[PDB]
Design a protein around this ligand. Sequence first.
Ligand SMILES: c1cc([C@H]2CCCNC2)c2cc[nH]c2c1
Lengths: 39, 156
Amino acid sequence: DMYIERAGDITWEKDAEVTGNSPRLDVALDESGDFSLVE
Amino acid sequence: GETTDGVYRVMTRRLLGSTQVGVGVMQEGVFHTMWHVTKGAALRSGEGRLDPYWGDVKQDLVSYCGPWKLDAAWDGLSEVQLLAVPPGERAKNIQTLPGIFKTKDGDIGAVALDYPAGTSGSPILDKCGRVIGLYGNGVVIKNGSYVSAITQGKRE
Ligand SMILES: c1cc([C@H]2CCCNC2)c2cc[nH]c2c1
């Protein structure tokens, strides 16, 4: 049995921590909703 | 139950203790999460019951109590924020510039941020605080790094 609990407002935070790169990838999406890399 | 707009944890007591299986967004009285978090099962909010209304396995999305309401889209140029809600931890904003998933059917924004699986359903937001999609359906690339699509539904 699943239940939900509130964790916060959805807002933009000024001066939030900034990280992560920005890859451009060729991918495929199958009928099961899974992405795979196309090479 | 609680119907206030915001981000929520999706929990279960079926396994050991209380386990977080995912996250979702309450907006305009509709609860939005990824299909793989709930598998389309009913949910509880306090003593209230939320029944599935719409879902699609290929989009990996599901809405409860009404149709999908989130319609904002990544502008393709600006940084966004993932409002990550990891299991056992406080909600935290992480800012990033999305990459892109290029598919035979068009391009989708993607975020190269790696969180535990129970963070799936956490919202990705623009500078106005609009939800542009949900985190948690993605791929593992060459490096072994995880990259999530910015998955958004369609508001009918
Ligand atoms: C978000 C979501 C996931 C899930 C998606 C469904 C299948 N794989 C697990 C993972 C796995 C590793 N990091 C993740 C972040």
